[PDB]
């Protein structure tokens, strides 16, 4: 089990760690989060009590180094940093633990939710999307835009998701205009799975990281990606039987985890009614359909 000590909490702030979050008052003695399950990606995130604009955060894997949080007042925000001195680090983590200055990652034993929301999310793949390779962790936030949102403006700060566009030469084979646009199996299976992602896991991993960035940061372009990658699967008549079953699990937990009131912005009426009721796969997402109809029956 690993730790993310904090130097201090200078400003009032709501802290998120994965799907949890805690309030911290200005100069309240708070010095980090402990008992973070080793073995998956994590994300720590922030929203200042004073300015709810710009939620921001750091994806990270403690198996990649020792990470702490330090507020920076020239820049006015909590910064993830790496300690190259292991000895110095453990020494600090143990003192805060003994003083008990740390909240414990409140993992319920029965709960696989986070595992389930990040099953295919790999830190290496994350740092390809958020390019900043002098850090082992990756900053993301509300306003950050995608390479597709820039094509329709700063590049170093872009979310380099895979571009998916159903009216692009990429997606449509000459002489199969009608076929490929009504049935996108080519685009998914040859162009996307075999061509760019290599496997279904890397695909599912980006889809999940997009979902998480929309939900924790209200990053609108990650929302768009997420829907694009659902719609692509759903708009193919030929999808490995195993990818359908996994996608149905994937979405279920994404649906289960969404805040109920946030439904109007993180769910796209059109795509879901299509995927669940018009798409080739309308009959393939039994758990996702069931939870959607029982929890957000309005949208459909």
């Amino acid at each position: 089990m690993n730790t993310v000590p904090f130097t201090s909490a200078p400003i009032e702030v709501t802290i998120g760690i994965d799907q949890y979050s805690f309030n911290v008052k200005e100069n309240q003695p708070f010095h980090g989060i402990k008992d973070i399950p080793i073995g998956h990606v994590h994300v720590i995130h922030f929203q200042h009590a004073d300015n709810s604009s710009m939620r921001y955060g750091y994806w990270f894997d403690c198996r990649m180094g020792n990470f702490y949080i330090q507020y920076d007042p020239k820049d006015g925000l909590y910064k993830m940093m790496e300690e190259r001195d292991g000895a110095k680090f453990e020494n600090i983590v143990h003192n805060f633990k003994e003083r008990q200055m740390m909240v414990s990652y409140p993992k319920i034993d029965e709960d696989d939710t986070w595992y389930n929301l990040t099953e295919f999310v790999q830190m290496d793949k994350i740092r390809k999307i958020v390019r900043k390779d002098e850090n082992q962790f990756s900053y993301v936030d509300s306003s950050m835009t995608t390479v597709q949102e820039n094509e329709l403006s700063d590049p170093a700060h872009s979310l380099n998701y895979t571009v998916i566009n159903f009216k692009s030469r990429e997606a449509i084979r000459p002489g199969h205009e009608m076929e490929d646009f009504l049935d996108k199996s080519y685009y998914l299976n040859t162009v996307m799975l075999q061509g760019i992602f290599k496997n279904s896991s890397n695909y599912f991993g980006e889809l999940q990281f997009a979902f998480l960035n929309a939900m924790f940061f209200g990053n609108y372009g990650s929302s768009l990606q997420w829907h694009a990658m659902i719609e692509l699967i759903c708009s193919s008549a030929t999808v490995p039987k195993h990818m359908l079953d996994k996608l149905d699990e994937i979405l279920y937990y994404q649906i289960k985890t969404l805040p109920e009131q946030y439904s109007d912005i993180l769910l796209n009426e059109r795509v879901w009614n299509i995927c669940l009721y018009s798409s080739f796969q309308k009959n393939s997402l039994h758990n996702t359909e069931k939870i959607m109809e029982n929890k957000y029956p309005e949208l459909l």
């Binding site: 009216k167 692009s168 030469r169 449509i172 205009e177 009608m178 646009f181």
Partner: protein
């Protein structure tokens, strides 16, 4: 974006554009089968692709063979129109290619956009206008050339005949739509009005009689009357 009442007059600037109407592409007759079921019989169609500034009508005949062996033919029709329009564009010199293609029905937008991907700078636009181009098969000469065809094929006509020698395209196009509107509303009546005077004749490379200016004003008012007449009859007013 969409063509509507605001920007009517862009149709007559010097930016090359084409209208495409696909209503007459897939034409069918319904009838009862011997068993008493209902079946369809396809007949020859036509893509209506019209440049409103010059009057040139790139009438692509759609032979019933093209449907043979196909499902969702109403939906294939839209994709076949787009394929043929693209080939028309592709076949034209570059300085002839349209800058805009205005589809009369919004269903044609995605097929044409997909077929035109190689022309990212040609804009596909819808229109909120109700244009009466489905009545094109009411022009005897188009209807004849379509129904006689034994193979896919493209016919050429000036939809304005020689009108632009004496009048502008704005005025030509208004004359065209009036005439087509009438034909749509009451074909029999409209035709009667056009041909009652057997001394006025239709030239060979033309679709409409050779009316003089004064004779067009007379025709033009009689169509208006025809169109009003038919409305009260429809709506009781």
């Amino acid at each position: 974006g969409a063509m509507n009442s605001s920007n009517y007059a862009e149709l007559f600037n010097n930016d090359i554009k084409l209208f495409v109407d696909d209503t007459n592409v897939y034409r069918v007759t319904v009838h009862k089968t011997f068993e008493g079921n209902v079946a369809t019989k396809a007949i020859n169609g036509c893509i209506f692709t019209l440049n409103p500034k010059t009057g040139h009508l790139f009438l692509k005949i759609i032979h019933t063979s093209v449907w043979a062996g196909q499902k969702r033919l109403s939906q294939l029709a839209k994709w076949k129109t787009a394929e043929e329009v693209s080939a028309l564009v592709r076949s034209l010199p570059k300085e002839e290619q349209p800058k805009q293609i205005i589809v009369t029905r919004k269903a044609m937008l995605d097929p044409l956009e997909v077929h035109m991907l190689d022309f990212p700078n040609i804009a596909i636009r819808p229109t909120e206008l109700r244009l009466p181009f489905s009545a094109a098969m009411s022009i005897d000469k188009l209807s004849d050339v379509v129904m006689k065809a034994t193979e896919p094929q493209m016919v050429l006509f000036n939809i304005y005949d020689d009108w632009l020698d004496r009048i502008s395209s704005y005025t030509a196009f208004s004359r065209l739509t009036l005439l087509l509107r009438a034909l749509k509303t009451n074909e029999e009546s409209a035709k009667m009005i056009l041909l009652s005077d057997p001394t006025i004749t239709i030239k060979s490379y033309h679709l409409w009689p050779s009316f003089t200016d004064e004779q067009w004003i007379t025709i033009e008012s009689q169509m208006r009357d025809l169109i009003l007449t038919e409305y009260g009859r429809k709506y009781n007013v």
